[PDB]
């Protein structure tokens, strides 16, 4: 049985372990580090896909596209902060018109 299934995870613990061992991060890598990291990565992925899935069906699409990811991310203050210097290709921007520019 895989380490990922032992950890309750979908993300690959073994691959993460190898990527840490060979990324020139440290001389040694502890048994719990890739489990912990894979879990963090999985958690953030689920957070974004949950929100993007919601936008996708609020636009009546069965497939998540970059727009939906952009909408999900910029409408969430914490995701938007975590990804504040990231450009999502083909994501566009949030609909936002400054109130002073509206008529009347």
């Amino acid at each position: 049985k895989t380490r990922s299934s032992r950890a309750g995870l979908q993300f690959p613990v073994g691959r993460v372990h190898r990527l840490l061992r060979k990324g020139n991060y440290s001389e040694r890598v502890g048994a719990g580090a890739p489990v912990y990291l894979a879990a963090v990565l999985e958690y953030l992925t689920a957070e974004i896909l949950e929100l993007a899935g919601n936008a996708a069906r609020d636009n009546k699409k069965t497939r998540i596209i970059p727009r939906h990811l952009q909408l999900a991310i910029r409408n969430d203050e914490e995701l938007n902060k975590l990804l504040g210097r990231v450009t999502i290709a083909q994501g566009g921007v949030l609909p936002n018109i400054q109130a002073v520019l509206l008529p009347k």
Binding site: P66, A89, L101
Partner: protein, 96 residues
């Protein structure tokens, strides 16, 4: 004949383009520019097409971001019209 008042169509265009994600610059001139500039750094360069598209996604996101800030500067000065000085304040505070 019918004629929209100045600003009405502008607003419509803002809603339209803020809802969409398509690239707003024409591909061939952008590509031409990239190759031209690239000439000054290294001779006989080739480009992957996706590299050109990466450059264009980045350039357009940069410009759209800059215009958002620029607009905030124009509005700060009680205008609705963006001006070069708005761009310049924006870039200065960005540290550009």
């Amino acid at each position: 004949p019918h004629r929209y008042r100045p600003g009405t169509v502008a607003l419509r265009e803002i809603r339209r383009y803020q809802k969409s994600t398509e690239l707003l610059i024409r591909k061939l001139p952008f590509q031409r520019l990239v190759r031209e500039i690239a000439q000054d750094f290294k001779t006989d360069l080739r480009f992957q097409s996706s590299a050109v598209m990466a450059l264009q996604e980045a350039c357009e996101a940069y410009l759209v971001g800059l215009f958002e800030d620029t607009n905030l500067c124009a509005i700060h000065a009680k205008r609705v019209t963006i001006m070069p000085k708005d761009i310049q304040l924006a870039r200065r505070i960005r540290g550009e």
